[PDB]
Each structure stands twice: as structure tokens, then as C-alpha cells.
């Protein structure tokens, strides 16, 4: 026959990866290279900007590593953008920029450096990086945690990074992976980045698609039509969203709710319960065999 590979020896010599690697969540190579603080820094916190793009929203967090577990100092999700006016498109480049900007402004408001370090009030698309001003407290500095995503040109993690940079954090970066850097020519124009920030590519798609075929247009945009947003409103509404985020960046928690304590899963079976289950099975089998 064939020799079995997964036998008792295999299972008793097996050695498992870390739990996060087993679930596929994290990359420990980059984890070690990115979260570890230098030794003569003496427990000075080292900060990360986590940017995770989900199938239906975007998660941005600012965290530093501690032995007991990662401590998160601020978090801004894309699903709370309907509070600020963005109804639909919660997983595009514009939403990434907006949620990054919201995270930056919320962290600045928490720390009390929000009046200072205003960043880019009027976005121009080209490079910007906040410069720490003397006398006043120094600018906040963090680094980008790209996770397992492929950091190729035109990526929503870099959109969120640009949003946070405009918000006012001093994140080191280069304008090479921003959407608008032309590799075959090796320059970077800013108006295309502005279009991507404002959703003009999506608007052009809607114009083109409704011009060609209304069936495909309706199929590709239905909640858009429901929230009656047209290609000619996106720039204005995203500018309003930016202004609103810069105005009121604080987060108010949802109030805690009473619980009726209803279990939805199944509790673990007990020792006597399973022993008597085996006993019943044996008795029933022997009864059938006699019968």
C-alpha cells in the first residue's frame, strides 16, 4: 500500500507555529522588526499605525507594544463615517484617507496638541510632512504597520497614511507608493492623487458606466442610488467630511446595554454524562445483538 505519514510518531514529534501564524493573522518577522524598542531607550513607547482593510470597512489604530499585550491608544473606524456624512463607499481610497485623518485628529485632540500641528487643511496631493515647532511640545511620531498586504503602488494603507499625515502625525514615508507615481517615468504628480482622495475615479466610473449601460450601472451601484449620491457631489461631500472631521474629531462611546443573559452556544458535557452515554451505547448495542 502506501506508508501513512501522519501516525503517532508524526503527531508526537509535531511542533506547531505560533497561534497567530496558525490563524494567519500576523507576520512575526516584520512584527519583531517593527515593534521592538531599542534597549537604551528604556521602555520608551514605540508607536505603530495599524491599517487593516476589511471586506466592508477600514480599521485604523495607534498602538505600542507591551509584554502583557499590545496597548491601543486610539482607534478610528470607517463605519462611523456616516456620522460625518459619508454614506457609501466605506472601503475605497477616499474612505481610507478620511478614516486616517479622523484617527490623526482624534489622537491630537486626546493629547492636547490639536490646535498646534494643523497639518494640511487644504489637501494638495503632493508631499507633506509635519515639522516639529520649537517651544511647543514636539510632534507625535509613529510608523506604518502594513500587515500582510502587498505594498504596491496605489494602496489604501498608503491612503490612510496620507490621511494621518494631513491630520498632523510625523510618519516617515516616501511619495513613491502613492497613487500617481508613474514608474516608467519616475515622477509624481499631485492632481491625480487629489482625484483619488476625492473619489473622482469612482465618479468617472459612474459617469462612464451609466453612459454605456444603465443595467450594469444599477447593478454596480444600488446603495449609491438609494443614498442618491451622484458623480457631481462627491468632491463637495468629501470636502465637507474633511471639514467635519477636523471640527469634531472626538469619539463618544455607545452606551452600555442591559443583558438578559441568554446562552447561544452549548456548554461542555460532563464526565459522568459522557461515561453514562458510553454505557447506554454499550447496553443498546448488546440489546440489539441479543434481539
Amino acid at each position: 500500500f502506501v506508508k501513512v505519514v501522519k501516525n503517532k510518531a508524526y503527531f508526537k514529534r509535531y511542533q506547531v507555529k505560533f497561534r497567530r501564524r496558525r490563524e494567519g493573522k500576523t507576520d512575526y518577522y516584520a512584527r519583531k522588526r517593527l515593534v521592538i524598542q531599542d534597549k537604551n531607550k528604556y521602555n520608551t513607547p514605540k508607536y505603530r499605525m495599524i491599517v487593516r482593510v476589511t471586506n466592508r470597512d477600514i480599521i485604523c489604530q495607534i498602538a505600542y507594544a507591551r509584554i502583557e499585550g499590545d496597548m491601543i491608544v486610539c482607534a478610528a473606524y470607517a463605519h462611523e463615517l456616516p456620522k460625518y456624512g459619508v454614506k457609501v463607499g466605506l472601503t475605497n481610497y477616499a474612505a481610507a484617507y478620511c478614516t486616517g485623518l479622523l484617527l490623526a485628529r482624534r489622537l491630537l485632540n486626546r493629547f492636547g496638541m490639536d490646535k498646534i500641528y494643523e497639518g494640511q487643511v487644504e489637501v494638495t496631493g503632493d508631499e507633506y510632512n509635519v515639522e516639529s515647532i520649537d517651544g511647543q511640545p514636539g510632534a507625535f511620531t509613529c510608523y506604518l504597520d502594513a500587515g500582510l498586504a502587498r505594498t504596491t503602488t496605489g494602496n489604501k494603507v498608503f491612503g490612510a497614511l496620507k490621511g494621518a499625515v494631513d491630520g498632523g502625525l510625523s510618519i516617515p514615508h516616501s511619495t513613491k507608493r502613492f497613487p500617481g507615481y508613474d514608474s516608467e517615468s519616475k515622477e509624481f504628480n499631485a492632481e491625480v492623487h487629489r482625484k483619488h482622495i476625492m473619489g473622482q475615479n469612482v465618479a468617472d466610473y459612474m459617469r462612464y458606466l451609466m453612459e454605456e449601460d444603465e443595467d450594469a450601472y444599477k447593478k454596480q451601484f444600488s446603495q449609491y442610488i438609494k443614498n442618491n449620491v451622484t458623480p457631481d457631489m462627491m468632491e463637495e461631500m468629501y470636502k465637507k467630511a474633511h471639514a467635519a472631521i477636523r471640527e469634531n474629531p472626538v469619539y463618544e462611546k455607545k452606551p452600555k446595554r442591559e443583558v438578559k443573559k441568554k446562552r447561544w452556544n452549548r456548554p461542555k458535557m460532563s464526565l459522568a454524562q459522557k461515561k453514562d452515554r458510553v454505557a447506554q451505547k454499550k447496553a443498546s448495542f448488546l440489546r440489539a445483538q441479543e434481539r
Binding site: 507555529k17 501564524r21 519583531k32 521592538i36 534597549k39 528604556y42 509584554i67
Partner: peptide, 10 residues
């Protein structure tokens, strides 16, 4: 892979 707490001790 080495656990990270060892690097994270001060």
C-alpha cells in the same frame, strides 16, 4: 521563531 517578550524586557 523567538518569542518577543525576551526582546521586550528592559
Amino acid at each position: 521563531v523567538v518569542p518577543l517578550a525576551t526582546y521586550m524586557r528592559i
